[PDB]
Design a protein around this ligand. Structure first.
Ligand code: CSF
Length: 245
């Protein structure tokens, strides 16, 4: 099966739906649910969240599901088993606090050469990949062979400036384009998989070849009265979780 991997950049709103593969799974990340339309449908194979806001995103995801705004088979925390990158207790107890979820590193680490490539450049040169790229590695580890990229623009497809998210991550007021491209090329080259770019106005199309024009239709379903901010747990919830925070 093929996979569409979506970051949340402007390009997400500029998909050339003519080039959509026949049959595919969808990977989403972080604040994908801020999208004002279902640019890639309601059904996710996997949603990926950063360790630092995992508690709050998992809580928000449960409401998205409850409220029939999205579905997802897998729930991934994009960790790396590095003390300077994420809380060691959170990781240690993860499956007991989030039993239907997965540590992304369980899959990421199956790519030995890429794990090594990433670890070296991060710890040595402070080269971090974005989640778009992390999702790619995990996809390859699950045996996907064709990856179609959207929403990756090297710095959203929506107003991210929402009260709760601003409270949790005040930086919504590390990375580079090159670091991401070099990682993608490395993955393509080393693991013999195919990258495609679904967004021809994206700066990404300079680097990855355009997915092929089939004559695909896609219905972009509208959203109303939808969850467009992350939800915050109660202070008693944080109390209980606190060893892991
Ligand atoms: C403030 C802060 O912490 N920003 C980071 C950001 O530097 C980046 F690390 C990332 O990406 P995030 O912004 O959510 O966007 C999701 C992914 O979509 C692609 N994208 C999006 C917008 C854009 N203009 N150009 C892009 O390329 C990138 O592949 C990105 O990783 C991430 O984990 O990769 O996550 C956010 C937050 O940690 C997260 O949103 C909190 O839940």
């Amino acid at each position: 099966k093929k996979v569409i991997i979506a970051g949340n950049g402007p390009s997400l709103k500029e998909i050339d739906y003519s080039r959509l593969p026949n049959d595919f799974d969808v990977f989403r990340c972080n604040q994908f649910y801020f999208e004002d339309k279902y640019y890639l449908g309601k059904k996710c194979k996997a949603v990926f969240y950063n360790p630092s806001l995992f508690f709050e995103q998992y809580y928000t995801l449960k409401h998205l599901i409850q409220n029939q705004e999205y579905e997802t088979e897998l729930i991934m925390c994009s960790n790396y088993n590095q003390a300077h990158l994420e809380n060691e207790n959170f990781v240690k107890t993860f499956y007991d606090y989030f039993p239907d979820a997965h540590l992304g590193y369980d899959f990421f680490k199956q790519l030995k050469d890429f794990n090594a490539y990433f670890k070296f450049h991060e710890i040595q040169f402070n080269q971090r990949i974005t989640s778009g790229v992390y999702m790619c590695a995990v996809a390859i580890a699950l045996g996907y062979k064709e990856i179609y990229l959207s929403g990756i623009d090297f710095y959203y497809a929506f107003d991210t400036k929402q009260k709760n998210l601003l409270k949790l991550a005040p930086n919504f007021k590390g990375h580079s384009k090159n670091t991401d491209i070099k990682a993608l090329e490395f993955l393509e080259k080393t693991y013999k998989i195919k990258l495609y770019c679904l967004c021809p106005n994206s700066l990404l199309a300079n680097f990855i070849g355009l997915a092929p024009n089939l004559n695909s239709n896609f219905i972009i379903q509208e959203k109303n009265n939808y969850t467009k901010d992350i939800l915050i747990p109660s202070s008693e919830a944080y109390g209980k979780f606190s060893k892991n925070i």
